[PDB]
C-alpha cells in the first residue's frame, strides 16, 4: 500500500503541465461557445471578402 | 572396535522439501496479488 501511495503521488506530480493544457483547451472551447463563434480581429493583417 | 533404514533419513529431509514447496507457493501467490494490487489499471 505504501508503494501504491507512492505511485499515485507520482501520478499527481507528473500531470501539472497536462492539466494546465487541458484547462487552456476548455477555456478556448468555452469562450468559442460564449461569443457565438464570431471571432473579432486582434492581430493586424489584411483580409479578403 | 540396508536401504529401508536410510530411506527414512531421506524422508526426514523430504519433510523440509515440503516446507520449502509451501514457502515457494506462498511467494508466488504474494507476487501475483502484489502485482495485481499495484500495476494493473
UniProtKB/Swiss-Prot annotation, chain A:
Subcellular location as annotated: Virion; Host nucleus
Protein purpose: Capsid vertex-specific component that plays a role during viral DNA encapsidation, assuring correct genome cleavage and presumably stabilizing capsids that contain full-length viral genomes.
Subunit structure as annotated in this protein's UniProt entry: Interacts (via C-terminus) with capsid vertex component 2/CVC2.
Family of the protein in this entry: Belongs to the herpesviridae CVC1 protein family.
Listed name of the protein: Capsid vertex component 1
Gene name linked to the record: CVC1
Residues of the full protein shown: 348 to 396 of 594
From Swiss-Prot, chain B:
Subcellular location, record wording: Virion tegument; Host cytoplasm; Host nucleus
Family: Belongs to the herpesviridae large tegument protein family.
Function: Large tegument protein that plays multiple roles in the viral cycle. During viral entry, remains associated with the capsid while most of the tegument is detached and participates in the capsid transport toward the host nucleus. Plays a role in the routing of the capsid at the nuclear pore complex and subsequent uncoating. Within the host nucleus, acts as a deneddylase and promotes the degradation of nuclear CRLs (cullin-RING ubiquitin ligases) and thereby stabilizes nuclear CRL substrates, while cytoplasmic CRLs remain unaffected.
Oligomeric form and interacting partners: Interacts with host CUL1 and CUL4A; these interactions inhibit the E3 ligase activity of cullins. Interacts with inner tegument protein. Interacts with capsid vertex specific component CVC2. Interacts with the major capsid protein/MCP.
Protein name, as recorded: Large tegument protein deneddylase
Species assigned in the record: Human cytomegalovirus (strain AD169)
Gene that this sequence comes from: UL48
Residues of the full protein shown: 2194 to 2241 of 2241
